Design a protein around this nucleic acid. Structure first.
Ligand code: ZN
Lengths: 108, 187, 199, 147, 1012, 184
RNA sequence: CCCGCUUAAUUCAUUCAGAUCUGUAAUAGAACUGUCAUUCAACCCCAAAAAUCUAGUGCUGAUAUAACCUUCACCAAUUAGGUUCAAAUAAGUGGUAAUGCGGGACAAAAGACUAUCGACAUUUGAUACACUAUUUAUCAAUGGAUGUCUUAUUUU
DNA sequence: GGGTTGGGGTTGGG
């Protein structure tokens, strides 16, 4: 119907795009939704308290602003009772960026 | 630490084995389609009674012990362990099957399983057992699958058996796939 | 002998005539209680004067059988043992249970005590169960277990509940209960008198 | 006829190429380094209230690459819903309409819609990395099996 | 009334079953749901497939399948994919026809076997049907409905739905069983009399070792307290000690003693064994008769058992009266036939529980709950009785005696002393090791066969002047991995040979195998005989002697290798069949399932891969029906393969290296094939059909060369040749004797039961002994050479009839058992030769008369056994028949209803459907009257029936007479209404009714019927 | 199901038909007019087509077909065969239920055909009539096979691994030896 | 016909296998020891019937030329004589069981019992416990039940 | 560590 692409990137690659539709995932930072990645934290637009209580992990689809701030268009949470691995996720993202496999995730 | 292998490698290394070889592997499969056209249990004494003297009127008397025994029910299921590579028909014995039945319904005890199944069947309540077995479809697990290249009625045949049925852990399966794919790209 | 068998048949006919078994009616019991009115000869040997004709029981059996085949009032066939005629020729302790669940049937309370194994008479009314015995020894023999010494409390199990009981009823109540058993026992008498008077 | 894990963009490209080049074998099987019929995918399932559709209940699987539209089925003798979707309705009513990722096995044939055979709710982000890695691995396995 | 019709439509029959709410053909279902319209076009083939296919449904579902106009029905899928989706929709349910020979795994269904009905589901008709339905409705039509598709003139095949064979299917106590069958065939004999050395009387012998060897009785679950266990152990020790004080020699000498001249017989047998040269022959007959004339009578062994029990078991163990009753019933236990037996209730229900003194109760229920006490103590008394019998009476008989039945006596039982039977065994070994058997050393047998096939065993049945051997192959070698007896190994070859047998009726000889074929041949011959004008007839009868031992293995294997009726490869398919029984349609209580109408039978068949005209590859079955009534077939997923080479190997083995054991010494045949194998019955007929075909060329053309009819039939042994020209019979005897001389067999006893006489010198037939009779007495039949009508031969005395009936009565389901027994005992042999083409009307009446007179005597023991139990104590029958004289009403009910059913079946057998109904009614009443007259006249003299039942039976018979007369009196008016035109058979029926004057009474007919 | 196809003893059928082929061949061509013998040996033209009898009707399961090189692959438990078929009519006549692959066929009639090739002979196998009897889907892992489209190497391969293949390869070699010795 | 007691003595024979002894012309005789057996015993072919049997009659006016009834063992077959929808007196055949001792007075139309028993005895319904052909208990209803005497003599 | 499927019933021809 309507193809709204939303690739995934690491934290450093956020500084490489500087404005584009992407999807980034992170764990909530406990004290205007704000979540820590990986120690570097990122800030967002969603109402921090508005999300459900049990949810500990989040993934957002939206456009990245200048840096460290991202407007969230799509918000996903789940009660992840297990420690979210990160290095495997970074490997998966890098393989998505690989030339040998780029023809699978995104067009061109 | 263990070394895993998919269903394709198992089926391959099984169809290239001579009579008398046994082997075990570990798979990140999932179980499906517990068959039900056979009988779902058998009888056995406590002292490893090979043959149990059958009687009428539900009387029972073992021979490896030679005392009037309360008959014991060991339920044995048959199902299919599959993956993103293949499928294999396996047989599940008393302990594993009881573990499964208990995981799907914690009310029934790991030792009450066979009696529960037999009473439901003989009473005339199979629909409940059918739905209970249906609730296990596509349940992810970690299997220890054993295969043996035996021969029955002078006919060569391969048989697969399941030894350990454990809950799954995505954090390790992910690392397994990652290291395998790294090896695959590196060559 | 020939004369012996003749006299035997004659005496058996004189004592077999239904007129004798009617005026005396002695052999009437043997005739009736017989299977098919065919009495045996083993009852003839117990006679008094028949032995006087004796002057090997089967020998005398066959002799009487011959003396009867020569006769016609009686009958004998197949030289059998039995004989028959050829004509019909007809013509100080009692206690009380209490605290019973009200409305409970008589069966429960009566069987819980019949477990004793000895008879008794019980009258149930809402809790009050007046029980009486016919033997005095059974009271002391039964109180050894019905009065459970584990608790030393007079308790009986009925319908899933504990019920109390007393070991001795008052003496004035005992005399009144004796007079009440007389009332009901003499009530049988007035019943039967009315039954005799209705006509 | 074996299951293959892939993402929404791959479904879109496959169906596009199938509808563009009908000069293939006259069989319902698609063609992606082989003849596949089933698919496995983890994605954001959410209902799609269509217009006057009694037997079918259109769905949708958003994802970080594209977006597809699946169809569910319902029992004929009793106009109710399957188990795996009734559980999802219950869980969505509980949390207050917060759509979660699910892992779905679905059968796709050509010149017809894409049914959804089964799905299960997921509550662990490692499933996402597992699915991506499964996709890449099986793709490489099929490609090097073609050569 | 609800008679039996000869033609029925499956649609009509299905409408009667109450479980099915809606049944119809597929065409009307498609017109109802508006999937098509009569204004549309359909080719003739597809429209006929829509008209004949029948569908059924347990709920009225025409509404749910109504045409929804939301989307047109354009299908892009195949048929396999739709069927796969349906089977997936089924899920875990495990009984559906479209699910045979396949397994569902996940969302993928796989096929693993040969369901021969898939051809029907994946044909073009079902493709067009899917086009008509559309997928989303086809997927559920294959589940909600039962679809039978006609594939044969009347036979339907079920291709989708629930399997019909699924409609054909708190606890209590069950007393043990007395293993009587253990007493019969024991060939052992020890030095000193008694019981086996393995019995508990002789085990290593202290009550402790007794507890050790009686570990099955000392710890039963019926003994309340350990006190009772020890109390009973004491009695067992006293039993053992009393047993060790018996000298069996004196006991055997007292009651059942050897003959006075036993030493003479021992010397004669030893002499016959010693002499290497062949001894005399008639002396051997006299010796066998002198040996068989030494059987112990029933009273003699009964006294023996009573006397051995009286001083072996304490009196109070059972009670003073219980012991007496037990000793009294022991006789009945002795004199029962082979397949009869006693139940523990027979003893229990006549014993008392409060007579056993050593019983005890933990709770004192002897007064509170007396009934529960009686139950709990019966559960012990029954085990006591089973112990006594199965541990004292059975081993003593099995050890000291040999118990078996005579050849001609039937099922009666005979007891022989042990030494006498050892002598008979020796003499038989001698008389048998000279002709065909011979001893053998396991050296000569090849080891491949030795490890493949199992062995057999030998039994001997005493015969008038000789013996009768029997070979049994039931054993299997547990060791060496042989899990099937020899018959179970030859089953497949037997299937192939049955397929062969279906072709020997007219191709390579003159063989018959069943009464249907014989009756058909007789019908044809009677037709030709009536055509020619009923000339005089002659016949001849003769039979081979020991056929199975007269066939040469070489000629048999040669005839096998060079036959073309036996293909090279066969496939075996297994299926199952629902056929129509004899229950008439119940004109329309609301609980009538399938088994009320259909009989289930599981069958197998072997077909050939050729393009045979039977086209079994399409259907999967081969059923030859006798009427136009439907039947359903469903295939199964159990195919096999058989090859001519494997059958060749089996034949070579069983014809060369067949070794059988006896008394732990082995024997092996020298010529012939072993009788006792499933395969031999057809092999003998084939081998002899070849030979007789070689020598009977003149019969092939003697029907037109000179115009002479002649029938020649043969079972496995017996010949029968009816003809019109004596010269043909003479030529037949000459050719048969010539063939016998040429091939090495001879006819039994040289007894030729002919009809004429002739000089036996002009044909070198002096050694035969012709016997002249005027009625063909073939196998249990009496063909009358003046009217050529057939009927059976019945016994004449109550004893001869009783010798072959085994009563077995159980209080559980009397009502069904007795009715079925009467139904069978009537329809056993009468059903085949009741053909209206063979016999005339009077012939049929006479046949029914004599057969009923025989079957009443056959049934009588069942009634006398029924009266031995009072039913008033059983609520199940007293609630339904009353509390006084319940047996009388019960017996009257079962008699009446079975006689009515039999009359209906006879009317079904005699007439067609086109006949008027009043004729059928008159003949039904006539047969009912005949049967009831026989019954009443046979029972009016007995004692158990004399009082009150005879009144009921007389009333019923008088009623049947009145109804017959009334029907016969109204038929005249109904016919004189002129609305009906009579065919020839109805005119014949009318002629028979008016000739015998059935208006007044039956007096004119009984002379023509009771005359023998 | 594996045993049902196993019991057919296909190798006996192949041996008998091969025997009949060579027998009738050197029976019908004993003229030995060397001019006609040179005329007969032409490349890519069938020298002799022997139809099979009616007793050699075996069944098998189709595992893979190829329409351009008209190749068929069948199997039965242990062994699998690679053969040819005459034309597309062979397929279209046998009423397949769904598809050529994964279906149980019975061969009503097949035939041997002899070709002359480079420096040697070659004997092929051609299936002429089939019929689909049922569908079966059970991947059989056949250890060994024989190819009737690769000359002698197609059969002699895996000869050591089974007695029956050994005997059939021996008979095939004897047949081609007699063939090349008769005409040449 | 019912009830209680009782019913006897050495071997009629010793298959198969093993180990001893005695004389020999091939045999014989003496005495001893182990013992159902592939843990199981049951022959096969073909053909006939098959309700989960509380579910089923035109529940039945006929042919005194008919149907019943009559015998001291018992039963099952053969002949004589009576009766009018049921009642009592016979005669030839064939088979089966047979030690002895002891008992077999209510027979009844009532009368008398104030003897008895709320512990009498039936009959029904209800409730328990049982059921494969149980010999019970309590309640209600009901009135009769029991032991003795009178119409009575071992030629019984 | 399991595995045709063990039956129940017993008439009449051979
Ligand atoms: Zn044990």
């Amino acid at each position: 119907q309507e193809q709204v692409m939303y690739p995934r990137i690491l934290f450093e690659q956020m500084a490489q795009f500087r404005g584009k539709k992407v999807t980034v995932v992170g764990n909530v930072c406990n004290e205007s939704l704000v979540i820590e990645f990986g120690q570097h934290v990122v800030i967002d637009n969603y109402r921090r308290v508005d999300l459900n209580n049990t949810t500990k992990f989040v993934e957002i689809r939206g456009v990245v602003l200048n840096q460290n701030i991202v407007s969230c268009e799509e918000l996903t949470e789940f009660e992840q009772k297990d420690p979210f691995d990160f290095d495997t996720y970074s490997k998966l993202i890098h393989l998505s960026q690989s030339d040998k496999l780029s023809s699978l995730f995104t067009d061109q | 630490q263990r070394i895993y292998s998919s269903i394709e490698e198992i089926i391959q290394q099984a169809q290239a084995s001579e009579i008398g070889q046994k082997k075990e592997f570990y798979v990140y499969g999932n179980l499906v389609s517990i068959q039900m056209k056979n009988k779902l249990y058998y009888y056995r004494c406590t002292c490893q009674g090979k043959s149990v003297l059958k009687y009428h009127g539900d009387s029972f008397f073992c021979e490896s012990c030679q005392q009037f025994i309360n008959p014991q029910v060991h339920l044995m299921l048959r199902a299919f362990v599959q993956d993103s590579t293949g499928t294999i028909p396996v047989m599940i014995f008393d302990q594993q099957s009881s573990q499964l039945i208990n995981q799907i319904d914690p009310s029934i005890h790991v030792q009450e399983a066979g009696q529960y199944v037999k009473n439901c069947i003989e009473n005339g309540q199979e629909e409940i057992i059918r739905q209970l077995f249906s609730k296990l479809d596509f349940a992810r697990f970690i299997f220890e699958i054993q295969f043996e290249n035996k021969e029955f009625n002078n006919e060569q045949e391969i048989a697969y058996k399941v030894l350990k049925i454990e809950k799954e852990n995505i954090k390790e399966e992910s690392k397994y796939l990652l290291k395998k794919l790294e090896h695959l790209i590196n060559n | 002998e020939l004369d012996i068998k003749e006299s035997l048949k004659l005496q058996m006919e004189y004592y077999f005539c239904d007129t004798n078994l009617t005026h005396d009616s002695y052999l009437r019991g043997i005739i009736s209680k017989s299977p098919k009115n065919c009495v045996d000869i083993k009852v003839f040997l117990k006679f008094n004067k028949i032995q006087q004709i004796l002057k090997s029981k089967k020998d005398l059996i066959h002799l009487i059988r011959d003396s009867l085949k020569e006769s016609k009032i009686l009958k004998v066939k197949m030289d059998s043992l039995k004989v028959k005629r050829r004509f019909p020729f007809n013509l100080n302790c009692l206690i009380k249970i209490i605290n019973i669940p009200q409305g409970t049937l008589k069966a429960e309370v009566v069987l819980a005590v019949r477990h004793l194994g000895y008879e008794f008479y019980c009258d149930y009314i809402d809790g009050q169960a007046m029980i009486r015995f016919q033997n005095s020894d059974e009271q002391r023999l039964a109180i050894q277990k019905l009065l459970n010494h584990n608790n030393n409390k007079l308790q009986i199990e009925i319908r899933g509940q504990i019920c109390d009981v007393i070991s001795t009823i008052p003496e004035d109540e005992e005399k009144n209960y004796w007079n009440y058993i007389k009332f009901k026992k003499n009530e049988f008498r007035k019943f039967f008198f009315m039954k005799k008077q209705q006509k | 006829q074996i299951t293959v894990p892939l993402n929404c963009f791959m479904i879109n490209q496959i169906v596009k190429a199938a509808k563009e080049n009908p000069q293939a074998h006259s069989g319902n099987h698609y063609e992606w380094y082989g003849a596949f019929e089933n698919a496995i995918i983890t994605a954001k399932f959410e209902f799609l209230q269509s217009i006057n559709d009694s037997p079918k209940i259109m769905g949708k699987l958003s994802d970080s690459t594209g977006c597809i539209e699946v169809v569910i089925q319902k029992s004929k003798m009793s106009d109710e819903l399957p188990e795996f979707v009734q559980a999802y309705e219950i869980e969505l009513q509980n949390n207050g309409n917060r759509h979660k990722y699910v892992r779905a096995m679905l059968k796709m044939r050509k010149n017809a819609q894409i049914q959804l055979l089964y799905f299960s709710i997921v509550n662990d982000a490692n499933e996402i990395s597992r699915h991506g890695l499964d996709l890449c691995l099986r793709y490489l396995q099929r490609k090097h099996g073609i050569e | 009334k609800q008679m039996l019709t000869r033609k029925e439509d499956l649609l009509t029959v299905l409408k009667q079953i109450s479980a099915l709410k809606y049944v119809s053909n597929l065409y009307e279902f498609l017109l109802a749901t508006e999937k098509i319209v009569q204004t549309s076009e359909l080719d003739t083939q597809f429209q006929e497939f829509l008209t004949t296919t029948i569908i059924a449904s347990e709920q009225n579902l025409v509404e749910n399948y109504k045409q929804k106009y939301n989307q047109p029905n354009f299908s892009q899928l195949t048929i396999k994919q739709v069927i796969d989706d349906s089977i997936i929709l089924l899920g875990n349910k495990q009984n559906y026809v479209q699910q045979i020979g396949t397994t569902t795994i996940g969302f993928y269904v796989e096929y693993e076997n040969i369901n021969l009905s898939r051809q029907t589901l994946y044909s073009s008709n079902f493709r067009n049907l899917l086009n008509i339905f559309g997928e989303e409705d086809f997927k559920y039509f294959l589940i909600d409905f039962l679809v039978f598709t006609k594939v044969e003139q009347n036979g339907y095949l079920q291709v989708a739905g629930v399997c019909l064979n699924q409609y054909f299917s708190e606890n209590q106590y069950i007393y043990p069983e007395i293993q009587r069958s253990q007493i019969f065939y024991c060939n052992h004999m020890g030095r000193e009399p008694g019981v086996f050395k393995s019995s508990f009387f002789n085990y290593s012998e202290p009550q402790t070792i007794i507890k050790k060897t009686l570990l099955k009785e000392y710890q039963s679950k019926n003994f309340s307290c350990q006190e009772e266990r020890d109390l009973f152990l004491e009695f067992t020790e006293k039993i053992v000690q009393n047993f060790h004080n018996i000298n069996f020699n004196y006991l055997l000498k007292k009651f059942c003693k050897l003959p006075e001249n036993y030493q003479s017989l021992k010397s004669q047998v030893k002499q016959i064994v010693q002499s290497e040269n062949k001894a005399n022959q008639q002396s051997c007959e006299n010796l066998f008769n002198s040996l068989y004339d030494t059987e112990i009578s029933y009273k003699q062994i009964t006294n023996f058992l009573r006397q051995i029990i009286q001083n072996c078991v304490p009196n109070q163990l059972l009670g003073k009266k219980n012991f007496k009753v037990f000793l009294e019933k022991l006789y009945e236990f002795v004199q029962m036939k082979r397949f009869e037996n006693q139940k523990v209730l027979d003893y229990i229900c006549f014993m008392d529980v409060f007579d056993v003194e050593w019983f005890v109760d933990l709770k004192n229920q002897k007064f509170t709950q007396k009934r529960k006490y009686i139950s709990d103590k019966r559960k012990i008394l029954g085990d006591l009785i089973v112990f006594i019998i199965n541990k004292i009476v059975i081993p003593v008989l099995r050890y000291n005696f040999y118990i078996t039945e005579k050849h001609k006596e039937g099922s009666q039982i005979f007891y022989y002393r042990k030494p006498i039977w050892k002598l008979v065994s020796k003499l038989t070994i001698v008389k048998l090791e000279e002709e065909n058997l011979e001893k053998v050393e396991e050296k000569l047998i090849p080891e491949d066969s030795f490890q493949k096939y199992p062995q057999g065993k030998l039994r001997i049945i005493p015969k008038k002047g000789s013996f009768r051997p029997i070979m049994t192959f039931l054993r299997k070698d547990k060791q060496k991995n042989i899990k099937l007896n020899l018959n179970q190994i030859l089953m497949d070859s037997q299937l192939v040979f049955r397929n062969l047998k279906d072709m020997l009726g007219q191709k390579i000889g003159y063989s018959v195998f069943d009464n249907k074929q014989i009756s058909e041949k007789f019908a044809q011959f009677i037709e030709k005989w009536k055509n020619k004008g009923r000339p005089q007839l002659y016949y001849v009868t003769l039979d081979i002697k020991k056929c199975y031992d007269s066939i040469d293995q070489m000629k048999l294997l040669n005839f096998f290798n060079q036959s073309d009726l036996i293909q090279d490869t066969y496939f075996i398919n297994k299926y199952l069949l629902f056929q129509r029984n004899k229950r008439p349609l119940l004109q329309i209580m609301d609980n009538i399932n399938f088994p009320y109408y259909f009989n289930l039978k599981e069958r197998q068949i072997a077909y050939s891969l050729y393009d045979d005209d039977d086209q079994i590859l399409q259907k999967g079955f081969k059923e030859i029906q006798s009427d136009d009534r439907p039947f359903i077939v469903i295939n199964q997923d159990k195919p096999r393969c058989i090859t001519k080479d494997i059958i060749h190997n089996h034949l070579k083995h069983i014809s060369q290296y067949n070794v059988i054991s006896f008394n732990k010494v082995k024997f092996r045949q020298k010529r012939g094939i072993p009788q006792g194998l499933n395969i031999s019955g057809v092999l003998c007929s084939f081998y002899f059909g070849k030979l007789e075909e070689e020598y009977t060329q003149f019969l092939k053309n003697a029907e037109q060369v000179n115009g002479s009819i002649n029938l020649l039939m043969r079972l496995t042994d017996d010949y029968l040749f009816i003809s019109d020209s004596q010269q043909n019979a003479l030529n037949l005897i000459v050719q048969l004797q010539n063939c016998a001389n040429n091939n090495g067999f001879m006819f039994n006893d040289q007894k030729i039961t002919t009809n004429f006489q002739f000089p036996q010198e002009d044909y070198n037939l002096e050694h035969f002994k012709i016997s002249v009779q005027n009625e063909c007495q073939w196998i249990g039949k009496s063909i009358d050479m003046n009217t050529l009508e057939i009927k059976s031969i019945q016994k004449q005395t109550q004893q001869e009839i009783n010798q072959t009936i085994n009563v077995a009565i159980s209080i559980k389901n009397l009502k069904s058992q007795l009715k079925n027994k009467l139904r069978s005992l009537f329809l056993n042999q009468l059903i085949d030769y009741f053909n209206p083409n063979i016999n005339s009307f009077e012939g049929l009446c006479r046949q029914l008369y004599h057969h009923s007179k025989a079957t009443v005597m056959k049934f009588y023991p069942f009634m006398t056994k029924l009266f031995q139990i009072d039913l008033k104590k059983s609520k199940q029958y007293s609630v339904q028949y009353g509390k006084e004289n319940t047996n009388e009403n019960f017996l009257k009910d079962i008699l009446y209803y079975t006689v009515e059913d039999v009359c209906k079946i006879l009317c079904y057998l005699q007439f067609e459907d086109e006949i008027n109904s009043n004729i059928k009614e008159i003949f039904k009443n006539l047969y009912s009257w005949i049967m009831w007259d026989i019954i009443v006249s046979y029972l009016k003299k007995k004692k158990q029936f004399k009082g009150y039942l005879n009144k009921l039976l007389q009333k019923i018979r008088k009623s049947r007479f009145f109804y017959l007369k009334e029907g016969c009196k109204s038929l005249q008016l109904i016919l004189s209404q002129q609305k009906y035109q009579l065919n020839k058979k109805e005119l014949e029926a009318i002629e028979f009714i008016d000739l015998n004057n059935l208006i007044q009474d039956i007096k004119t007919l009984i002379p023509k019927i009771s005359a023998k | 199901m594996k045993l049902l196809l196993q019991n057919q003893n296909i190798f006996q059928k192949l041996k008998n038909t091969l025997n009949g082929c060579i027998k009738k061949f050197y029976d019908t061509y004993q003229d030995l007019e060397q001019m006609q013998k040179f005329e007969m040996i032409v490349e890519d033209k069938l020298l002799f087509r022997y139809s099979c009898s009616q007793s050699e009707m075996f069944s098998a399961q189709i595992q893979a077909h190829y329409l351009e090189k008209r190749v068929l692959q069948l199997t039965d438990g242990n062994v699998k065969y690679i053969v040819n078929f005459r034309d597309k009519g062979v397929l279209d006549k046998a009423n397949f239920f769904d598809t050529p692959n994964n279906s149980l066929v019975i061969i009503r009639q097949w035939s041997y055909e002899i070709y002359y090739t480079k420096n040697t002979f070659q004997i092929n196998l051609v299936i002429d009539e089939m019929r689909c009897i049922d569908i079966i889907t059970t991947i059989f892992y056949c250890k060994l096979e024989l190819d009737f489209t690769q000359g002698i190497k197609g059969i002699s391969k895996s000869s050591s691994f089974s007695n029956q293949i050994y005997e059939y390869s021996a008979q095939y070699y004897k047949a081609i030896q007699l063939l090349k010795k008769l005409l040449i």
